[PDB]
Nucleic acid binder design. Sequence first.
RNA 1: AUACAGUGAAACUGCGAACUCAUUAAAUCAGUUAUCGUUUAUUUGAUAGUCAUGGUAUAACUGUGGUAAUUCUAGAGCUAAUACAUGCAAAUCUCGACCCUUUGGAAGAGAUGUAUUUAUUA
Lengths: 236, 623, 138
Amino acid sequence: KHLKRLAAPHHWLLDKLSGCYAPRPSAGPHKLRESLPLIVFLRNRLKYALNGREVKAILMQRHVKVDGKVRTDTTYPAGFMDVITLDATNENFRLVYDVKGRFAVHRITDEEASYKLGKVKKVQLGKKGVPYVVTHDGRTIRYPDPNIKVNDTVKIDLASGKITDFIKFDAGKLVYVTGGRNLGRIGTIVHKERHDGGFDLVHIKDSLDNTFVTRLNNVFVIGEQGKPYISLPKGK
Amino acid sequence: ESTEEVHLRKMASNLRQQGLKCLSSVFEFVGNTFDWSTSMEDIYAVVVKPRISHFSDENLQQPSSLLRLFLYWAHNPSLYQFLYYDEFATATALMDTISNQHVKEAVIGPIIEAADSIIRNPVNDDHYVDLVTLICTSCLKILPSLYVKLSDSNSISTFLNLLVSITEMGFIQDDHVRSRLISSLISILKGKLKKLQENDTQKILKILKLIVFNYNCSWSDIEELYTTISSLFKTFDERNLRVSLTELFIELGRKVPELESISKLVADLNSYSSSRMHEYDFPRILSTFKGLIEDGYKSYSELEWLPLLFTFLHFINNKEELALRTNASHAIMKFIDFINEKPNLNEASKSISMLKDILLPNIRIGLRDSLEEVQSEYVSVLSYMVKNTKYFTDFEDMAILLYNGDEEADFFTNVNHIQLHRRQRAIKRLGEHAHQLKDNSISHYLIPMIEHYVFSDDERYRNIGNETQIAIGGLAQHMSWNQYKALLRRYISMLKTKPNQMKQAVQLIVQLSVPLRETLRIVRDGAESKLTLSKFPSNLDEPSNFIKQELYPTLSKILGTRDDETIIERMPIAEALVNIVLGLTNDDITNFLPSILTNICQVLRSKSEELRDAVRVTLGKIS
Amino acid sequence: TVQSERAFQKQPHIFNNPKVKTSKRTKRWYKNAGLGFKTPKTAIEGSYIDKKCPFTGLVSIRGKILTGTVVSTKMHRTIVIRRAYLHYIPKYNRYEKRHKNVPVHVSPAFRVQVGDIVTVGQCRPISKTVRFNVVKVS
RNA sequence: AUACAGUGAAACUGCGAACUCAUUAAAUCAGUUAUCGUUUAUUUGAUAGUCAUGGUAUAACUGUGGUAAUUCUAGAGCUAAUACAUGCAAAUCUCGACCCUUUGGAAGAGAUGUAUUUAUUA
């Protein structure tokens, strides 16, 4: 199960001179390709811990809380729209992709860190006739707003796991793309169409009026036009 | 009353419920096999006597085991002694529960069914007679409060069966109960075909006829019931229902002397032929029409008109016999002639109000009807009434459109002419006559005719529809702005309904939006001359803020309708959207013009060359 | 004849009650295939029973949608369509046409002759070599 | 430590234990789908009302022995479980007449695990 340093993904931005073997992300909320391990986050990125032993010491000492709860696994997968709380420093980070296509932290405040946006991949009726939604991180949230459909974004309180607000998939809404050649791009969508012998294709317009087309499962509605619910890094 | 042991109380309650439902289930499952007579008194003393005092309040919410046992006792003839104990105490409790404010009709229904079964099944006992009389009195008291409360069609049918059984018994002889039953029957007749089944309606009519035969009726109540029966005979297409209404009219004529003559005329009109089943007598109908054309229309009273007016409307709506339709049109013309020959303005206005209540919506329905013969008969009747009567404004407008009765000048005469070229001349003449026709008259009359001409499937008739669409766009200015908005909503509904009609709807939308654009531009400019749209709102802000805020969702729907066939229709829709933008305020036009421009750009962005050329022609017209 | 085979041919989990006479001859179940393809009236009032039919069977259309010209209709409830796609050979320096044959299941609702352009859609493997089912016939 | 309580051999239990030789050109491989056609130890998020405490069978351990002898053995004696086997009507709701009295208290009438296989009904 040993993953090579060259075989490590480009999203992590590791230093190749560091070691022979890259960390392998554990099973968890996000898939292995778009995950970012906590050891990579703390050691190679935040430079807090110099080596994996004191990375394990930190994650023992429970300063690092991921999405509210406390994780002690060194290779715990932390992914897109994940809030990491370092309680000793009182600094909160939100993981967002860079425009070039790599992971990046964002310094966020406390009341921003209190909520998290998730893409509703499933809407279904569970047992005893209880509706539920399955978000992109794997969360199952009971009793949603009946207006919530597939590919809509829900703002989730971290303390309770409850949906406060939601954004509907609609033309002229600021979405974010999370896959493919277009990865790391922020833009409002022109439209959505069906591709013959293919899938739903979404046409998105950037700030500089450039048009780029991607898969339906790749998009992520971060907010409506002119009001992003989350903070965004400099450079748009 | 020891409340110290809630466990004991719950155990006692559970034992009571299980024991009662067990006794009920024993009663239906064993049936009429066990000799119940030996344990009858013991059972009634034990389980019925304490709960009998509060059974009426207890079982109001939902059916219960004790209530089901009572219903099975009422159904089984051998179990009648259970009810007969204590002078119909259980029956009185059930009747009180029915009479009280029950939570649901699901408890009211089976009690009425059991009462009907007990009435239908006779028993030879003095207690049986007393219980039957008490149940009949309770049902007669409860019936006006039960007919309204009954929300189920099966429950209404059961109530009608119980009323028929009560009428067969003849329990009530008072005229007040007859008046209450007549009011209930009128309320039942005021309904729908989905609400009341045809067999159920026939049974209700038979019960009403039996009640009318049993009870004497005053003149005013007989006239009200005759008007209701006339409306019912107009509504009922079934000849069995027509025969039932004829029997009811015969009963009303037995009740009242002038109603005897009226019902004799109605029965002569609606007399069924013996040779053809469920078919009226053509020679008798022709003789009645010949009498009504010359001697009848002077003889018939104002109240007596309404049954024959309903019969004539039904005959005109019926497409079975064109001769009968012509006879009905002649009868309507004779009624209009009687209204004109009445010297009093109030006497003419009574018939005018009767026509506006009945005959004018009937003519509107005939114009909207797809039946060409019925539409032509309605148009001919309208023209004859326009010639006969000088009072009525749409009649004056129709005379102005007739223009001294020339065949080419008259829109109706050239339409009745078989020549499509004459129809085109009529449409072109009506386009100029829209400047003189009334707005309400145009909206009531020419719009169904123009819609029929547009929806006609022939190619020459499609040219007629295009000319009528141009005339309708011209007359939309001559029409009221509310009528224009209603016509736009109807066109949007037709576009949503049929794609083939949508292209014609798109053309009509453009040809109505261009006068709308001109009127809105004149309102924005504040021109001293009156706007094109007749009776337009004084505030230019309100009409624009209604029309544009309605048309922008329509423009969005047209843009979202991204179909290749719809794109041709969307091009006239794009022209209408450009007209709406031009009619809007200039700053609002400057804001909304990026949206229409982007829609036109998406239309022209098609890779197909022929679609691009068509969109280019449309965009050239739009520019 | 719908009952030609030795086993009884019925739509699964559809029960018409012998106690109650029905105005329809048999209860029949039809499903909207999706992708904007209308359910044909032959499938609506057909008497045929087919598992592999996208409108009246358990087979659902998902994946790709293709178009092709019908070549052979000899085999039962299956057709062979030919798709001609232009190919570039660098050594020849010129575009050269190539064809691929796709054996496609045909529902009995559609009647296809040789040389008719048909629209097909991907489904679960119908047989050893069949993965495509017709959904629109032009 | 007058049940054990520190640290703990053995044992029971639980988890992990998924180099050589032969040469295929729609095969392999590379992408690309599909799984409304499938399986899950783990991770993560959900999820379960429908006796102050049951009976054993053994290991390690005692002992008596057989074999030239193996991580081979038989006889008798011991006692533990997150081993194996066994096993428990109330409460919550809806319709609540009527009462006052509006929030309200209540005559009463009724309802109520999960899994497996199939048939039937939305």
